[PDB]
Design a protein around this nucleic acid. Structure first.
Lengths: 119, 64, 84, 153
RNA sequence: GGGCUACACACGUGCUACAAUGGACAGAACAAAGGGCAGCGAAACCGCGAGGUUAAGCCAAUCCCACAAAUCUGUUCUCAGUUCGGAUCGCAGUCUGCAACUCGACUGCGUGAAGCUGGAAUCGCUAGUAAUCGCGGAUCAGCAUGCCGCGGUGAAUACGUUCC
């Protein structure tokens, strides 16, 4: 479990079912299915005994789950050892793309708490 | 071997999507298997599979 | 950036060129941080003009497309009161 | 000051009566007459499908069943609030009826909004559901505490 | 060259959502007003896209910016952190500009925060008003969720001066 992207779900149509794969998104799924000719097909999981394999190969050409996590990880590790400034933003809790800090930007900062008063 | 505690083990028929088969033993009469050592890229020598590691690093960026 | 291409002011170009062909002089200040790192520029160490003080910067093989002035932050950290 | 003039609604072609147009006004959200239109006709259709009866009849009985006879009105003359029960204006009756109707219909939780409006209006027809229960609750807040609002105010 | 964009946090004010009256796809259909020659730039072609190549016309009730969007019609998902929402970030491109690191915009791909309607408290509005959907302009090399306008769809209630 499973034949291609590991741990694809069940009782869902195949396109959203492999969008869950850490790699393929929506439009990429539209492309791999355009190569497939499945036409959707199948709402549940019942494709075909061999077609599941040929799709397994095309998905195999795409790459790849936790190694793709290793891509981003090795990339940011490349972005910290380089100096730096971008990875510096990655670990300050500072947003990296460049969008102030005086308000909001809590996506990294977190909620609580507060430690100031006047007067 | 205690009686009735241990499930019966009929001769297994391991199978795979690549058509590879293996003769073992299991509770089930037949066992389809998604992945085998003869199909997995690591056990099968050093197949490119999808990588092609290190392409490209740490630098190869030029355009004219 | 865009295409054709990354843009040094061009004085740094002839400077690092002369420094590469001969002399092998090390540590030089620059005010023009806008210039991108180049493969010919590799291994040099430049004092980067943040404004307040120059910050020396070695160039590893890994850095090229990043801006030369990016490595030195003008910003002072943090500054905050009661840490921990 | 004085009483204000109020416009009459353009009658709904189906079922003719203007009151259904009042439903088209209340059920509507985001200013969409068409979405209220579709939910209205699908509402008449789902009523037609289960337990056969004229939609106008079960609707009329429902709206008659969802109008409170009395309503309290809080007023702080002193310590703690003091509601005063009073006979409701018929326009206010149909207004409260339709508003609690659509409000409780919204919270039914059914996958189909039309089917739960159907279940709700039939609950009003059957003297049950959250709407009739709420009118009964208003009936409890009233009468039991009408003594302060007997003929004083 | 920086900084005016700081960052442990507080507050004011907007935007987007927390979804089946919905999301997504396909088809079909109705505007107003404004801007344009150092400009608008059609059509044809290249690129998935952004845009690019090339170039007609227009000093404009002629032509261009320009396609209206909600909606309607069907297909599909069937109630969940979801085909809900889009945050954050990575990679690869693109427009403007000597030049996009600080500190620009946009696109393709990938990543898929929080949030399932919000305590105390508080704001607007009496009809084409509130509700909501798109468009244009001033600004302007580039940068408009702000501001100023344009039109589409379009309600509920007003017993009354007891109380604020």
């Amino acid at each position: 479990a499973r034949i291609a992207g590991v741990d694809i779900p069940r009782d869902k149509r195949v396109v959203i079912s492999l969008t869950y794969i850490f790699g393929i998104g929506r439009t990429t799924a539209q492309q791999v299915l355009k190569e497939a000719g499945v036409s959707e097909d199948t709402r549940v999981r019942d494709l075909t005994e061999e077609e599941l394999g040929k799709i397994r190969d095309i998905i195999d050409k795409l790459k790849v789950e936790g190694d793709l996590r290793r891509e981003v990880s090795l990339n940011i590790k490349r972005l910290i050892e380089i100096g730096s400034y971008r990875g510096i933003r990655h670990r300050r809790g500072l947003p990296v793309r460049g969008q102030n800090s005086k308000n909001n930007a809590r996506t990294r900062k977190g909620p609580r708490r507060t430690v100031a008063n006047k007067k | 071997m205690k009686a009735g505690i241990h499930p019966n083990f009929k001769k297994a028929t391991v199978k795979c999507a690549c058509g590879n088969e293996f003769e073992t033993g299991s509770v089930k009469e037949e066992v389809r298997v998604e992945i085998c050592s003869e199909c997995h890229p690591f056990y099968t020598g050093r197949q490119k599979f999808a990588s092609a590691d290190g392409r490209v690093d740490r630098f190869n960026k030029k355009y004219g | 950036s865009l295409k054709k291409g990354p843009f040094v002011d061009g004085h740094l170009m002839t400077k690092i060129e002369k420094l590469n062909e001969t002399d092998k002089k090390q540590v030089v200040k620059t005010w023009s941080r806008r210039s991108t790192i180049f493969p010919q520029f590799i291994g040099h160490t430049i004092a980067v003009y943040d404004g307040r003080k120059h910050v020396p910067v070695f160039i590893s093989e890994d850095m090229v497309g990043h801006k030369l002035g990016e490595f030195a932050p003008t910003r002072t950290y943090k500054g905050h009161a009661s840490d921990d | 000051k004085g009483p204000v003039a109020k416009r009459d609604v353009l009658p709904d072609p189906i079922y003719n009566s203007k009151l259904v147009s009042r439903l088209i006004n209340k059920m509507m959200i985001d200013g969409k007459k068409g979405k209220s239109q579709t939910i209205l006709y699908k509402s008449f259709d789902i009523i037609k499908e289960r337990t056969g009866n004229d939609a106008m009849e079960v609707f009329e009985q429902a709206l008659k069943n969802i109008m409170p006879v009395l309503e309290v009105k809080a007023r702080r003359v002193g310590g703690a609030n003091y509601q005063v029960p009073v006979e409701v204006r018929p326009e206010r009756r149909t207004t409260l009826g339709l508003r609690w109707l659509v409000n409780y219909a919204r919270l039914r939780g059914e996958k189909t909004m039309e089917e739960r409006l159907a279940n709700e209006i039939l609950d009003a027809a059957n003297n049950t559901g959250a709407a009739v229960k709420k009118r009964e609750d208003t009936h409890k807040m009233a009468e039991a505490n009408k003594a302060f609002a007997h003929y004083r105010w």
